[PDB]
Structure formats: C-alpha cells, structure tokens
Amino acid sequence: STGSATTTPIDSLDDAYITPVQIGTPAQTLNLDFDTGSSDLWVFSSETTASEVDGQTIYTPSKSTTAKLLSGATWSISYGDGSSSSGDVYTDTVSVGGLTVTGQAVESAKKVSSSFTEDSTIDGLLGLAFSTLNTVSPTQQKTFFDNAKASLDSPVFTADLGYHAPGTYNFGFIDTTAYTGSITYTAVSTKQGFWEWTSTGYAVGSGTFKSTSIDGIADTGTTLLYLPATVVSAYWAQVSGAKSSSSVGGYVFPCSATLPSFTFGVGSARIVIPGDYIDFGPISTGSSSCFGGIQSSAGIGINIFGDVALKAAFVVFNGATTPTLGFASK
C-alpha cells in the first residue's frame, strides 16, 4: 500500500505545516502537524478542557463506531519549545492520503498549553520519530508509520515541504519526479529516538564549503535551523547589520538585507538553502528589524535540521531494519 497527502503552511512564514488526517468511522478530518521529532499522535478532542479550545477542530470519539478506549492509559508530553499537552488514549482507524491504519493510538488531549490553544490552525500532532519516544503509559504505543510499515510497498516516508507553498508527505514509495539529480543516503542513529544523522559540513553563500561533522536531527516539527554557535556566527557575519539580540531571542537583521544562501553537506552531496528561506519577517508588526531563520542550538543540547533546512530538499525517511535518511535537491 501507499499514501500521499498534501501538507500546507499554516501562515505566510511557514511557521508550521498541516496535513489532513481522517480519524474514526465515519471519518472526522483533523489538520495535524506531522512531526518527525516526536512520536505521539494527539488531538484536540471532546475531552479537551473547554477553555483551552479556541477554533480547533476536535475529535469526538463517542461519534466513532471504531473508537476504543485504552483502559487506564494516559499520556503526557513536553516539547522542546516548552509547550505541553496530556490526556487519555483511544485506538481508532486513521487514514493519511489514502493509507489506512486500523487500531492506531489516538491520544485525546484533556489539557493543552497556551501555545496550542492560541494556534487555531493546528488540531494536533502526528509523530513520526521512533516509537521509543512515545509517552503513553503504562504501555508505550506505536507511531502511525511504525504501524503502517509492514503493509507499505517500501518501508519509507518522504517529506517534500514547500517554501511559501504546499508540499507533500508520501508513504511507501519514492516519487522520482519530485527531485533533481540523485538522492544521497546517510546513516541514522536511533539511540535518542530521533532521525539523527551527521552532516558533513557547511558553506555560507558563495563561500567554500567547510568539511566538518555536524550531528543533528531531521525534524519537520521545528520551524528553524538550529546549529552550533560557531556555524551560525559565521553565517550572520556575512549579513550587514545582523546581530544577536538577547531581548528578541536570537539573530536579527535589517529587513532590507539580501541574505546569503546556506549549504549543508549530506555525504559528498550538498543541499543549498536559498537566502529568502532564512527570512522570518519583522520581529514585531511594523518593525524594520527581521528575525533570522538560522539560530544557535547552544542550550538546546542538540542540533536541529528543521523546516528551514528540510524544505530545501526532498527527504527520505527510510524505516528499513537499519534506518537511513536520504536527501536530494529539488
């Protein structure tokens, strides 16, 4: 089997992307944030504290003939950005782009933090990291991909995120028309539960590529590119007027600037992020100062190849017995 679904930016900055997901019988369609950096499929629901719901579409398990309550099970997650959510657990039929998993754990939120409430466009998350990170207790549950894997034509999914435009998540096949050149594959460590890999280096604009190992995670659920302070300083030093602002929370630059590209290595291959992808707009409405899309990972504890990096590539998440990642230009 296969599936194919369009993913759409939530706003004009590509802050996140939402993908329609069918849950239950009859289908209830919710728009979920596909997150390769976490492993819980959780939704706003009829159980979510009413005051914490503000415009989201909710899952109502009592209206689904296929919903089952997982007796006594609970879940609770905290994300790197400080957001959180928690609740109880159902299993139900879940379909993405024509691909159906029966008995998928659908984690129903009783509580969500303010950042989720405040974002009316995101009805929940669909985790695509390794199931070892799933937070269900007492017994951890499997991700949508882990459940679908054995049925897929090939044990893979691909992320093809757009810049200021829709893109595509495919399950079970590689669309050979969706990228230019060849896909370069690279090793993955699953030891921390992430799609963790080692980039072979970077370049800033037209500068000569520096060969150096950069360990990080491929994370569709993180907006920006977070890299070591050395690398990030080298990038912003090439932007007139750029500086790190502790009050703003990162590197800012004059909105009138022409940003250089940023290149990262995948083996001997190279992915070039155009300068425009690194512009995240005025720091506040009407400001001439803009927020940068490449920021330091110091204090995160891990480097994160988030949407800024991933949307410059066609990315293969290969869930074979020994997982790998593939990257192609597009």
Largest β sheet strand count, sense and barrel closure: 7 strands, mixed
Number of domains: 2
**Beta-strand share of residues:** 35-45%
User: What is the fold named in CATH at topology level of the largest domain?
Assistant: Cathepsin D, subunit A, domain 1
CATH arch. level architecture of the largest domain: Beta Barrel
Q: Strand-and-helix sequence, N→C?
A: EEEEEEEHEHEEEEEEHEEEEEEEEHEE
Distance between the amino and carboxyl termini: 25 Å
Class computed from helices, strands and strand pairing: mainly beta
Based on DSSP secondary structure assignment, what is the total number of beta strands? 24
Task: Output the number of helix runs.
Answer: 4
Which geometry do the CA atoms define?
A: globular
CATH superfamily of the largest domain: Acid Proteases
Radius of gyration: 20 Å
The largest beta-sheet arranges its strands as 18-17-12-13-22-14-21
Q: What's the level 1 CATH class of the largest domain?
A: Mainly Beta
Helical amount: under 10%
GO molecular function: aspartic-type endopeptidase activity
Family: Belongs to the peptidase A1 family.
Organism: Cryphonectria parasitica
GO biological process, one term: proteolysis
